[model samples]
Structures are given as C-alpha cells and as structure tokens.
Target: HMSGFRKMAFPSGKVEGCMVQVTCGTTTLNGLWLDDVVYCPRHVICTSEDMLNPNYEDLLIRKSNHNFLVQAGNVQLRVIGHSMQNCVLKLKVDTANPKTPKYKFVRIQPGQTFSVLACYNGSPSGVYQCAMRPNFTIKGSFLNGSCGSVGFNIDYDCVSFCYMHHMELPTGVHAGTDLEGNFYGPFVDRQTAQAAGTDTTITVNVLAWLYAAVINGDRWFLNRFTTTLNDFNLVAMKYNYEPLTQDHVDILGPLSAQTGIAVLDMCASLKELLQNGMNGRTILGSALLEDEFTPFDVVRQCSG
Candidate 1:
C-alpha cells in the first residue's frame, strides 16, 4: 500500500522510517531514519550547493564529532569523509580537568594520520585495543596515577595494512561512504590500487581464475593484514573485471553474445551483491547510530 514510498519536503530537520524519501533541497535521500539521525541506502547527502547558500549549519562529516563541537563557536565547522573509505578510528581528548576528562570519537578509513599529545608532569603512557567486530578503546594514565593531569589533547589517525601502527582488520562491514558522503556497498579497497595484475597461474574460465585470484589475494592480504567477505568481493570484482583487460573484455564479449544480453547485465548478474556487499547504512553512520549521543570512553591509567 503506502509502503511503496513516502515523499517529504526539504529541510525536514528530523527524519525517521524506511522506504522514506526526504527531499533536502535539490537532492533527495531514500532509506530509514532513527529519530534525528537519517540513514540512506545510497551515499547521497545534502550539500551547501544543494541548499543554494542557505545559512551554513553544523555539518557533520564521517568522523570528528568533537572537533566540530569544540570548534563550533566562531568557526563554521565542515566535517568531511575524505579519508573515511578505509577502517580507521579517531579520537579527541580534552582533559582540562585533572580527574574529569572529556572525549570525542570519530571512526575513519585508512591513510589519514593523527597525533596524540600527553602533556603531563609525571610519566605518561596510553594503550588501545581494537575489536575485530566493531569497537575500540584507548586507556592509559599520566604519571602519579592521574589522567589528564596536565590536560592532554590527542588527534589520532587510525589505518590498516600498515607497518608499526596496524590494528586488526575490523570484521564488521557496513555500507561505507565515499569522499562525497554518498553510500556504497561491496566496499572497495582503495589501499590496494594495484589489483593483483594478471593471474599468472591459471587457465580459462578466466572469470573463475580471476575469482580465485581475488580470493587468494584477499586472503593473503587478510593473512598479511587481517581484514572481510564484503572486502573479498570488492577485490574479486576489482581484479575480476575492474582492470578492463583484453581477456576480461573477451570473456564478457562471448558471454554477452551467447546470452544476447548487454555487457552491463553480464556483469550485473555476475556477483551476488547482498552476500558480498554492503546492504544498507554507512560504516560511520551505523556506528554513530549504535552509540547515539554517548561518546566512546577514553581512560588513562598509571602505566604498568
């Protein structure tokens, strides 16, 4: 019945429901919302251009919730998802009070870097452990068993598959957003720009070969990096067909010709999107939705 679709006007302040279409200025988003937070199946978002110079409001990007909250005054904050493609964890700590410390959490993708400043009188150290599923905590203490004694501040960038600062590959994969803040599934690995050039060890059913290669490469990447099936399919699709090689085209050509279908369909029906891809919600949005208004806790303990 009405479940087909529901249309709402732009600047709807708060949205909630599934199969709901919200018109935000020139653009529209279709998905479900929980209270004030909106979740769109697609990565589409309302931008200033879409608003046509409407008064700049608080813009929350993928990560850095506190950065904006702390800097909201006098400065128009514009949060972005530029580096949110990969699995990353970011935090901001404001320990202006010796015993009481305030924290902010923003999850991100790999590549983006950050730094932590532990300004204290005695010895200062911090430790963090990430969850394979989808969570992480940072705990440590300054000298003399007091955290944020001198009020330390930290800006950290979390990334994966790197040396000297690698966290385990987070297993939980949600629909991730792009630099443009649009949602997408079957998360692509931008880190591996070079998708295992040419499967050196295989035969025809190049699709099969490439598929195997992708799985193998992904496994090796995981073994070496520890990272997801959704990711697996991404690499699968990347190596299988993204490269646009002669053999790949040749394979698609024969299949398309025999089936009397366009190459697009040949690829479209090729993979099972649901099983190997992000179905809905964004990596950042989903995480934030889970935590709601509670910021991830950052505790500092006396170093052992």
Candidate 2:
C-alpha cells in the first residue's frame, strides 16, 4: 500500500559516497540505505513522521530497447568516402513480391563499415533476405556522392541474436520494410544460436561478482540477469562461445540469472564508457555508478 511513498532500491553499483544521498534525520546513512522503510533522502531526514501509513515491501525500481540483431553471416552494406562516417542514409529492399520486405536505416559514425544481421519475424514466412544493391537515397546523392552495395555474406558465420523464439508467426507475409527501416529475415528456418568465442575462469569470476552485487526474484532483477552460471557454462559450451572457465558462485550472492551480456560482451561494454570521458548521469545494468566507474573499479565492484 505504498500510495504516497516509495520503498528503497538496492545499492549495488553504489560506492562509499553515492550520488543520490540517503540520510535519516540528524544521522545520515551515507552509503548505507534504510531500504524497505519509508525514507526520503532529499527531505530533511528519515523518521517515523516521514514513514507512510501504508507499509510496503517493494515500491519501485525500473529493458534492453536496442533491437540490433548483429550476427556473422549477416552482411555489411557499405558506403564509401570520408563523409560516409558522417552521413545518415535511407536504404530499401524489394523482394519483388507484394509480401512486405524488410529495410534498414543505417546511421554511420567514425567506423567506415556498417553491418546488417539476418533477422526474422519469429520464422520463415517473415524472412528478410539480401537482394540487388538496395535503393539508396543518399544525402544530396552527388556532392556527398555515396554509393551502396550488399557485400557477400561469405565472410562471417556465427548466429548470435539472429532468432527469437518468443514471437509467433504473424497473419500475413511481409516482404517489405515496416514503419521504421528495420527488416526481418525471410529464411524458412531460424538461425541456430552460435558461440561468439571462448570463456575462461576469469569470465565466470567477473560475471559472478557483478551478479552477486544485486538480488532478483520471480519479477524485478538486475538489468542483464538471465541464467545461472552452471547452466550458462553448459549453454556456452554448446555454442563454444567463450573464454570462460574459472568460477561459479558462493554463499553471499550470485542471483538466479544473468543480463544476457556474456562476460566477454560485458567486458567489452565496460570499456565502452571509457572511450569518451563524457560526463552524464545514467544507469547501466539498472545500477547507477559513483561517477562513471573506471574499468578497474567496474571489475573491482563486482568482486568487492
């Protein structure tokens, strides 16, 4: 019955001095939180007077919204020139059939290359295949004069997020792009999940520490939480995507699942924030950082 007030959120990524300070009247908890209790740090203090009439257990907390199905056999649609990195291009694919086809609107940055992963609408009827050079509407066509082409999928061959089992087949056949420029794979079969690499002891250890920091139940959980370590080990083995080997879990922590970001993937992401010393307040894995943690602290907090 937390109608007017809210309960506390767990302090996982929190360090000695947290950004959102929590205090209790004359004495402030500093980094320690009086969770499950009706306390407001922004206010003067935490006291019985501030407590809500209706007590509650869990009041609030907070998806992965990025839908890039990046995979190997997935091809890269390249645009040449230095301006290629600065431009935003509109691309289209026509399967020639009325069944709507899929298209992707690729926005380029510093990297000279852009990749398109084969994707689907749950299954075959809704597939997206590469065809002749996609029609391009380059910015001003001539001055920036960029061209487009579908490179052979001949290079890589690993199926990562290429398929999703939860979505069922839709009613009609679509051979074209939807509201957004995104497309679905037209393959009759779902691409099997393939291994991205190899995991070592440090893999699980690093992952173990992060998962250990937060707690999850049947509903609310750590942002990337997905599976158990042992189960993940077995699953990762099936795909051979690893560098993982060393650890598992211990008595104090390690929740029931993971964040789907593999240790390597996550290890990679940890480095992403460091690329730019940009300052901003945001959350990762649903936990706020002390002040944009360094890669070392990122790992340190997990095992700490």
Candidate 3:
C-alpha cells in the first residue's frame, strides 16, 4: 500500500544509454517487503517490480523521480507535476536542443513565493533532463514546498493522460404465476364409465360372455389365447412389473386377451383378402376367439 505522496516525470523521452535516477524522500521506507519496485508509466501507480524490461528504449514515462540513466542513444524527459493539499507544482520542460544540455531556474525565501521549471535539454535529439521544484506552502494558507529549482523542460506534448467511463445491469425475471383464482383456470369434472344397464354396457357384457366361450372349449382359441396372454405377461415384466398389483394386472388383462385375439383374426382376414399380408406375421398365424374383444374395443368398433 502506498502511504505518502510521490512525484515523477511524464513522457519519458528516448534515452539510449543513460538512466534517470530519482532521489527518494526520507519519508520513503526502505525494506525487503518494499524492495521490488514496479512503475506503470501510464496509470502512475508504482509497485514493487520492474513491469517491462529495465531498458529505457521507447518507454513513455508518466511519473518522475528515481535515477533514470541514458543507456544507449539520446532520451527525452518531462516532469509531470502533482497537486496536494492546496499546493500545485506546474511542470515545464525545455527540449530546445534535442541533443544538447539545457536548464531552467526558480528561487524561494522565508516569506517569498516562486514559479519553478522542472525539466531541461540534454546532449542529443533524444537526450533530455527532468526536475521538480516545490512552489508554495499551506502552513498559513499555502503548503510547504521542498524540491529546489532545477534545469529541465516541460514536455507539453506528453500531457498527463486520463480515462473515460462506462457501466451495465445484472439480471431480469421474465414471468411467473401465484397460487390464486386470478392466476389459475377452473378444474374440469372427471369422465364417468357407462352404467351396466345401458345398451353399450350390455353389449360389452355379451361380448365378454362370448369371448369366455371361445377360450373355454375351442382348442384353436385356447392355444392362441394362452400364447397371447403369455406375451402380455412378458410385456408387463419388461415394463418392470415385478410383484405387480392385482388391480393393475386386472386393468390390462381383459383388454390384452380381447385385443390379442381380435388382432389375430383381423390379421388373418386381411391376409386372406390381400396377398402376402400374413406370410411372415405372427398375428395372422394365431387363432381368433370371442375373448379377443374387450368391452372397450367392442363398443368402440361397433359404434364406429
């Protein structure tokens, strides 16, 4: 975490072989935890590690302070000012001789004030010198100024940069309903089975009575009926009907018996009427009996 105020240069010019050094203030702590120093030339937030390489090649310096040496060619530099309390340092750099050394000056006294130049010109096109001079104080109505008048030019070309703004929402509920009369539909009544005295009911009973006859004494009906019944049992087992309830079995048993026989007879009749229809079909090869027609099937078929 950064504690006190700090300052640096902006638009660090091209310095081929020289290094720019910053003399840290006495308030600056020196320790292992604070050893690694990282400088973000853009945001002006200095951390503890050299982010990019240490080479002063084409780096754009945002803040100043610390020793920056010219490594290879010439380097340009600028002092980026800082504002604290009520005091503001106006930075100015003179890069007249992009190669030769140049400077600027400012003076301050016990009761006097001063405007200071913070940067200067160096030996080559890329060569340059940067500095800072504290201007005023805030003791009475102004703040204390520390750094002295140094020779340097202000790189107005490298004005301190800032950023822009943007934003967004997180979630949305589409639709829903509550358990209330206003939100729900009316319940419908259940369908009732026909009474036993009705014509339809009587017809179903007669058909069931006839079906029982066909299976009871007829060998053909008995064989086909047993086979079809066993088939239904296997189908029930296939559907995980282990120890299935009697009511469930009963519900399907009569319909199974009737449909199986009727299907066999219809298949046979269709085969006789149409060539090759029953040749390889089990339904056509099986026998037919009255038991093959359920009350539901009888009513449905007869009605239609």
Best by TM-score: 1
Question: Candidate 1: misplaced stretches above 4 Å?
Answer: 1-17, 33-38, 41-45, 48-304
lDDT of 2 by residue, 74-96 (tens): 22212111100111111111112
> Taking the tens digit of each residue's C-alpha lDDT, what string does model 3 give over 8-113?
2223332211122222221111000001221111211223254333222222244353322211113333333322111111222222223322222222111111
Q: Residue 282 of model 3: what lDDT?
A: 31
> Which pairs of residues clash in candidate 1, taking residues 3 or more apart in a chain or in different chains?
43-182, 43-183, 86-109, 88-108, 114-157, 140-300, 140-301, 141-301, 186-278, 222-226
Residue range 65-138, candidate 1, lDDT tens digits? 32222111122222231222232211122312122212232443221222222212122233322111111211
The better-scoring model by lDDT among 1 and 2 is 1
lDDT of 2 at 15: 13
Q: Can you tell me which runs of candidate 2 are displaced by over 4 Å?
A: 1-202, 212-230, 238-304
In order, candidate lDDTs are: 0.25, 0.22, 0.23
Rank by TM-score, descending? 1, 2, 3
Q: How far is candidate 3 from the true structure (C-alpha RMSD, Å)?
A: 39.3
Clashes of each: 10, 32, 64
- CA RMSD of each candidate after superposition: 21.9, 27.2, 39.3
